[PDB]
């Protein structure tokens, strides 16, 4: 395909070229309709600066870079790739997963003094929410929350997920915002600022921690030392630091696609009206009429030591979708005599 990759050089030409190649590959995969979950495993094998790349067992086979330019101080890379969009996979027949973006906090407010970027966590969780909402393939964002999610309180995680109707809750801590000064006699000072982050995803059905990853990137701080920067403004997010943080958010989305996309989606029972039950997933999540679903009885217990545990009882109950709304759906129980055993909170999975 014909794609362009744009990335600014911070300290190494190799890193900027690799970032531009990643951007071009991401655009090519998005246009080709291929899954973006598989991209996050291709990057490690892209550390080398070889003109030709060979891969096996992937939707992309050979990568050939034809043009590399450093116009306006940032590397531009033009490549041609062959993408094979597979019609099958463990991610195409699943309903969309609702995700709640939790509180992202700055561990050390001391590091945010330069620029007074103290609301960077909130304005970055907003970016992560919008990235998951309008860029992901298998995720739906149900908003942000002001509460902090911890692994010590699975019950609170379950309650907050129930309140917001979220299958997973994602929250992080920003651990490094410090900067160093590089000085040259010919020119002015260069301030390279750090952005480290540790993201954690919790399963709202049982309170377990299902995802855990750490990110660290560096970018130039173009603003003055004594200048105050607003994190909601376009001045912050159009700068080199802002571009780096946007790339970090994209990597978060790609990692979530890589890890959670092929987990089987489990819509929950919202209400039971005799022989008809209601599902928390609807038309906007990919539900189509005539779908057959299998019911699981949910029983998740905190064990004797306070650690969350999971236990599902298999059921002989199968349901079919009768009416579909934008955000909910109605299902009819195919075994009327077993309809009395369905309670609120039981989960279902689509029969393939």
């Amino acid at each position: 395909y014909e794609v362009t990759g744009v990335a600014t050089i911070v300290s190494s030409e190799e890193t900027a070229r690799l970032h531009a190649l990643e951007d071009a590959l991401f655009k090519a995969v998005n246009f080709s309709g291929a899954d973006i979950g598989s991209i996050s495993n291709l990057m490690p094998l892209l550390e080398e600066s070889r003109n030709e790349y060979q891969f096996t067992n992937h939707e992309v086979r050979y990568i050939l870079v034809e043009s590399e330019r450093k116009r306006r101080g940032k590397v531009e890379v033009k490549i041609r790739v062959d993408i094979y969009p597979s019609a099958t996979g463990c991610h195409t027949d699943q309903y969309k997963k609702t995700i709640l973006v939790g509180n992202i906090e700055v561990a050390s407010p001391q590091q945010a003094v330069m620029g007074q970027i103290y609301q960077v966590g909130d304005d970055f969780s907003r970016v992560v929410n919008r990235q998951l909402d309008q860029t992901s393939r298998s995720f739906v964002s149900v908003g942000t929350t002001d509460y902090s999610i911890s692994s010590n309180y699975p019950a609170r995680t379950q309650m907050i997920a129930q309140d917001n109707g979220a299958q997973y809750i994602i929250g992080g801590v920003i651990t490094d915002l410090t900067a160093t000064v590089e000085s040259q006699l010919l020119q002015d000072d260069i301030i390279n600022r750090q952005f480290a982050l540790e993201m954690k995803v919790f399963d709202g059905k049982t309170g377990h921690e299902v995802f855990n990853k750490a990110y660290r990137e560096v970018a130039r701080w173009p603003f003055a030392k004594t200048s105050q920067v607003d994190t909601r403004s376009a001045r912050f997010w159009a700068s080199t630091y802002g571009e780096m943080m946007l790339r970090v958010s994209r990597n978060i989305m790609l990692d979530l696609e890589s890890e959670l996309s092929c987990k089987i989606t489990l819509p929950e029972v919202v209400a039971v009206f005799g022989n008809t039950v209601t599902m928390d997933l609807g038309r906007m999540h990919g539900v189509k009429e005539g779908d057959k679903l299998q019911l699981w009885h949910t029983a998740s217990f905190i064990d004797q030591n306070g650690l969350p545990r999971n236990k599902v009882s298999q059921s002989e109950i199968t349901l079919t979708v009768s009416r579909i709304y934008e955000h909910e759906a109605e299902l009819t129980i195919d075994q009327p005599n077993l309809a009395s055993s369905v309670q609120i909170g039981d989960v279902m999975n689509k029969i393939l």
Binding site: D35, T56, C262
Partner: peptide
């Protein structure tokens, strides 16, 4: 040879 994304899992 690229690592393959996680396969289908239940619970």
């Amino acid at each position: 040879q690229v690592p393959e994304k996680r396969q289908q899992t239940l619970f």
